[PDB]
Each structure stands twice: as C-alpha cells, then as structure tokens.
C-alpha cells in the first residue's frame, strides 16, 4: 500500500479484491491497468494523486485502488476488462457503475465526491445512531 514513491494507490488481488470492497461498506474505485500500455502509463501518477485528493475530500469514505488486468482474470472476466485503462466503481447494497471520461485525477476526483454524499453524510452535525440500529 503506502511505501516507495507512490501516491495512495492500494494493489488488489483477484481473491482479495472482494475480501477488500464486500467485505467494506466503502466506495472502492477499482482501475486496471496493463503494465504493456500507455494510455495507462499516463495515468499511473493521475489516479495516486487522485487517490489521495478523493480519500482526503471522502474523508478514507471514497477509495482508490489499482488492479492488472493481466494478472487478474476473475474479475476481469466477471465484468470483462479487455480495454485499459478501465475505471469501475462499486457501492455495497447496489450494482456497480462504469467510470467513462477524464482520465485525470482532475476529472477522476471530480466524480468521487458526487457519490461521496451518496453514501457518506455531507458536512453537518448529525446523530450518530443507537447501535446502528
């Protein structure tokens, strides 16, 4: 996860992966990448730095984590991942959606935060709730 020269860009498995997101109540922004493509390479330093400006604006609610199509085959077929980058996003109760647009942590934030309040409470004093129930 944190280490080396990287921004906040968490690696995931193809068993972890759900281990992760369903086993999370948390938006988890899935992106895969191959290690063989541009159009990828470009957006390596563009998701790390979206990362971190999503989970310090979700405030950790809104994740972002990285994944290689080329080494994961079982979620990479379960939706089918063949054209990379592929930025795909997922909310536990509902069906995932597709990220289709910028590619820059610019435009990548940008959508984080729109699902931020989905799930996550805006900002304004609010009960927290008897034991979640």
């Given at each position: 996860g944190s280490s080396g020269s990287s921004g906040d860009?968490?690696?995931l498995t193809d068993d972890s992966f759900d281990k992760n997101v369903l086993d999370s109540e948390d938006v988890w922004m899935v992106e895969f990448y191959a290690?063989?493509?541009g159009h990828?390479?470009?957006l390596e330093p563009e998701w790390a730095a979206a990362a971190s400006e999503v989970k310090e604006q979700?405030?950790?609610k809104v994740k972002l984590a990285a994944v290689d199509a080329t080494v994961n085959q079982?979620?990479?077929?379960?939706?089918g991942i063949r054209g990379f980058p592929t930025i795909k996003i997922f909310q536990k109760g509902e069906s995932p959606v597709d990220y289709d647009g910028g590619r820059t942590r610019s435009d990548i934030?940008?959508?984080?935060?729109?699902?931020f309040s989905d799930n996550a409470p805006p900002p304004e004093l609010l009960e927290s709730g008897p034991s979640s129930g």
């Open positions: 860009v968490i690696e290690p063989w493509c990828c390479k470009n979700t405030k950790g079982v979620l990479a077929s379960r939706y934030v940008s959508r984080a935060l729109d699902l």
